[PDB]
Design a protein around this nucleic acid. Sequence first.
DNA 1: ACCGGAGGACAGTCCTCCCGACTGACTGACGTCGTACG
DNA 2: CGTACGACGTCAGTCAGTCGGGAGGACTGTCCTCCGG
Lengths: 89, 89
Amino acid sequence: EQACDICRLKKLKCSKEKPKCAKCLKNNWECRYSPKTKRSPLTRAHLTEVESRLERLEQLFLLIFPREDLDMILKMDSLQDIKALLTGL
Amino acid sequence: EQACDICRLKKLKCSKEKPKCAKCLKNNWECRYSPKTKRSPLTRAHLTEVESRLERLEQLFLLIFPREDLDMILKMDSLQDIKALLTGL
DNA sequence: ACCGGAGGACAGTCCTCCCGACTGACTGACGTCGTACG
DNA sequence: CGTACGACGTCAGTCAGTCGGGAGGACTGTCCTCCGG
Ligand SMILES: [Zn+2]
Ligand SMILES: [Zn+2]
Ligand SMILES: [Zn+2]
Ligand SMILES: [Zn+2]
């Protein structure tokens, strides 16, 4: 049922046999069944919890930045830089 | 499929006919079919838009103020409280 | 080879709506008091 | 004066109705695998 890391990336049918499978035995390959990777729950209640948090921060930032491209700031990645910027408060 | 407003509110089978229906007609009430309520899409792309912007507003918030404040805002429902928070600077 | 997307089992929504519990109201029964008669 | 009967009032029990938890289930959209171009 779970396919192997590689068959997964290569997208071919997996034989699925453990410990090494079809191809991964053949091409003498590093065959892993990596564990099931978590996501946050897609439920309505959780969408809504997260939308309520986002609204409140969104509101708090309308007052910090009444003037624009908050989105400019939101895209930056550098900490010094962002902080150099803000010290134009 | 859609039940009338009153049957919905009361949770009894609706006849659903046109215009009115059995119990609004009988019981003497103004039977309505309200529009479905617009909600946000519960897709994964959309939960991720929203979790990942909330995260980045949290990251920026923390260059400006202490983490203990993050936690307060993330819970406030009152617009005076979100603003006062900011006023104690 | 490689990878866009078809295919499909599955996760979880989001409707209408049946069913059970709880509360209120109404009716009946009993008890107590008051009046009348011996 | 004392006893008995009737009437009224109060309490309990039963039934009905209504808010509610939530079952049922069609459906929306996920999130895998792996086809075939
Ligand atoms: Zn494999
Ligand atoms: Zn393998
Ligand atoms: Zn109806
Ligand atoms: Zn109706």
